[PDB]
Structures are given as C-alpha cells and as structure tokens.
Homo-oligomer: A and B are copies of this chain.
Amino acid sequence: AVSLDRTRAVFDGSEKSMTLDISNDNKQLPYLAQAWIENENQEKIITGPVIATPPVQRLDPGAKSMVRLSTTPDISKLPQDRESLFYFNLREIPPRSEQIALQTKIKLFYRPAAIKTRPNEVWQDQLILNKVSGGYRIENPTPYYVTVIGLGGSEKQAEEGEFETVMLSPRSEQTVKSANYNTPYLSYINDYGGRPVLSFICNGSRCSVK
C-alpha cells in the first residue's frame, strides 16, 4: 500500500536536509509508514550521520505524506571528495485487523558539496573499459558511484540485452563478464533512475567514449 516516489536518491551535501514523498495507494484502509537508514554495509544506524524522520507515521486511506532526511554535524567526518553510500528503508504496517518485509529499499548517495553536480551533468562517460579474458575491467575515475546495467555490441543490445549489474565505487575498478564487442555500448543508471546508453570505441584493449 505504502510506496516511495523514487527507486534511488542522491543527498545534496550542500544542504542540511531533503524530503521523499510517500503515499498510501490503499483508498479504503489506513497504513503505517516506517522508515530508517542503513550504512553502506546495510547496517541500521539510529543517530546519524544521516537521519530519517519520522521513524513511524500514519497515513489514512489515500494519504500523501513524506519522510525527511537530514544530516548531523558529524556528517563532516565523511570524505568530501567522493560519494558515500547509505540505504533508505520503508516498511508498511496494515490495520491491526490482521516477518520483516519491506516496501522498498533504495540506495542513498551522499554527495558532498565539494563535488556537487550541475543539472544534467554527465560523468559516467569517463569510464574506461579494459578488454580481458571473459569480459572487461571497468574503471571509474570519477568521485561518484557508477552503476552499470547494460553492455552490448549495439545500443539496442545494451538495453534489451541481459547483463549482471555492477556498481563501481568512486575511484575504483571492477572486472565484469562479457563477450568481446567491436563497438561496446554501455548503459548506466543516472540519479533520477534513467538508463542512458554510452557509445564506446576501442584501441587495443582500452576502450573509451566517443
């Protein structure tokens, strides 16, 4: 019944807080919306650096409320030259007229003000594919988390084709499995949940974006 307004979020480090919209799609019954944060290791954290409030709230049939995320002063102890990962969790509680199942678990990227991004900015095009045996060794030089959900020999394939999603941490690299493609097409997930497609060009084993 209770749902979120997005499948992922980014926290603007230059702000003290932000908000996420929730709703009770059930127009005949009241539900409870429980929310909480977890660190990158998916462990629950009650007092900072990122807070989610209110922990619990009631939403009458068809209600449309929201949950607020804010930071504590300790948020400054996190690196300011790279994104930090957190998880936002939402669980619903039906009428007591009636197991820890969730409504949705989305990633929450803390983006320090230092590396703030301008609207519609692309940085995922800085990924470097390195041909290897069995696939590629993708490199992420950017200070952000880059999630790759597609990789094919053509654009339509990087979208329709099946791929083992992988999330590269800031300034890191990982090796994925793939067939050797003449002109590799990468597909990633942006901040709003979009699936843009990048066209790459190789030169030996090192492939880069056009």
Contacts and interface: CB of A to CB of B under 8 A. Distances in A.
Interface of A: 3-4, 7-8, 91-92, 100-106, 147, 149, 152-154, 156-157, 160-165, 167, 179-182, 189, 193, 195, 202
B103 A179 contact: no
Contacts of A147: 162
Q: How many copies does the complex hold?
A: 2
Given A162-B165, A164-B164, A165-B164, A102 B157 contact: no
A182 B92 contact: yes
B7 A102 contact: no
Contacts of A180: 100-102
Main secondary structure of the interface of A (DSSP, over half): mixed
A165 B193 CA distance: 18
Contact of A182 (B103, B106, B154, B162): B103
B4 A154 contact: yes
Contacts of A164: 164-165
B7 A182 contact: no
B165 A189 contact: no
Contacts of A160: 7-8, 189, 193, 195
Given A164-B165, A182-B91, A157 B189 contact: no
A102 B182 contact: yes
A102 B153 contact: yes
